[PDB]
Amino acid sequence: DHVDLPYNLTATKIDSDVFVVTDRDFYSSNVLVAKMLDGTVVIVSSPFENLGTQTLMDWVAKTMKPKKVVAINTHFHLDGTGGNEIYKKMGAETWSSDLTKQLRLEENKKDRIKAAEFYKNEDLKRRILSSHPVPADNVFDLKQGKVFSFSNELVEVSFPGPAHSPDNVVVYFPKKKLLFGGCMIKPKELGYLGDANVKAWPDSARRLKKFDAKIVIPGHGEWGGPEMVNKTIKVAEKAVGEMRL
Numbered sequence: 493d494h495v496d497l498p499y500n501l502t503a504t505k506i507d508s509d510v511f512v513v514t515d516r517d518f519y520s521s522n523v524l525v526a527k528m529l530d531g532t533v534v535i536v537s538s539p540f541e542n543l544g545t546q547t548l549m550d551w552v553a554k555t556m557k558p559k560k561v562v563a564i565n566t567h568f569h570l571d572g573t574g575g576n577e578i579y580k581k582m583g584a585e586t587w588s589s590d591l592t593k594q595l596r597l598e599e600n601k602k603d604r605i606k607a608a609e610f611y612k613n614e615d616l617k618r619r620i621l622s623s624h625p626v627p628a629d630n631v632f633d634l635k636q637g638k639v640f641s642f643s644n645e646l647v648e649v650s651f652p653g654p655a656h657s658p659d660n661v662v663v664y665f666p667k668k669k670l671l672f673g674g675c676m677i678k679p680k681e682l683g684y685l686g687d688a689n690v691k692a693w694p695d696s697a698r699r700l701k702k703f704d705a706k707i708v709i710p711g712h713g714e715w716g717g718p719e720m721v722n723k724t725i726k727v728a729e730k731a732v733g734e735m736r737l
């Protein structure tokens with residue numbers, strides 16, 4: 493039910509065949525790992541970089557013996573796209589919205605530009621550009637979302653509107669009534685606002701109530717029930733009020 497892994501990762505069982513894998517160095521960041529009845533393992537979000545992702549994938553190999561792996565990017569930030577390089581190297585099928593891929597490409601370019609203006613050390617410069625994440629191989633139109641069927645078992649990817657980021661999506665598992673809300677679930681404080689649409693956040697979070705969720709999993713920290721959505725709306729609304737948005 494709970495294991496300590498190398499690289500300060502943990503894996504915690506939350507339901508039959510469903511685990512949350514967490515990086516304790518990176519503010520208790522959450523990755524969902526769910527095994528379908530047909531042997532498919534679905535991974536939602538990612539660790540920030542290659543060593544974390546490879547550790548995760550090795551744990552999946554040893555404990556889940558997947559017939560196939562499908563990874564779904566929640567948004568363009570590193571906790572979302574940081575695993576794509578390693579997922580792909582392992583032959584996993586990586587998915588995101590079109591907008592997520594677009595913003596990841598834009599962000600890489602912005603960074604390459606800044607690296608050009610800044611770095612005098614040529615050895616270092618190559619190492620940072622080399623550290624860039626890649627987008628997913630497979631893409632869906634953000635607003636229509638995507639429904640996977642794994643031998644009749646459904647996994648729904650859905651855009652409730654912009655919140656933590658312009659492209660943030662959630663993943664719902666209707667059989668187990670499990671919602672991975674990721675970084676748009678913020679029960680106490682909103683965190684990083686650089687890419688956020690705080691004005692839209694209350695409405696976007698309200699849309700998550702359309703899911704009959706028994707468990708809601710956030711991008712960081714403990715999960716909970718449907719009340720995780722309620723708490724997020726109050727948090728977002730407080731921020732809208734404070735910031736006059």
Ligand SMILES: [Zn+2]
Pocket residue numbers: 567569571656657675
């Ligand atoms: Zn983020």
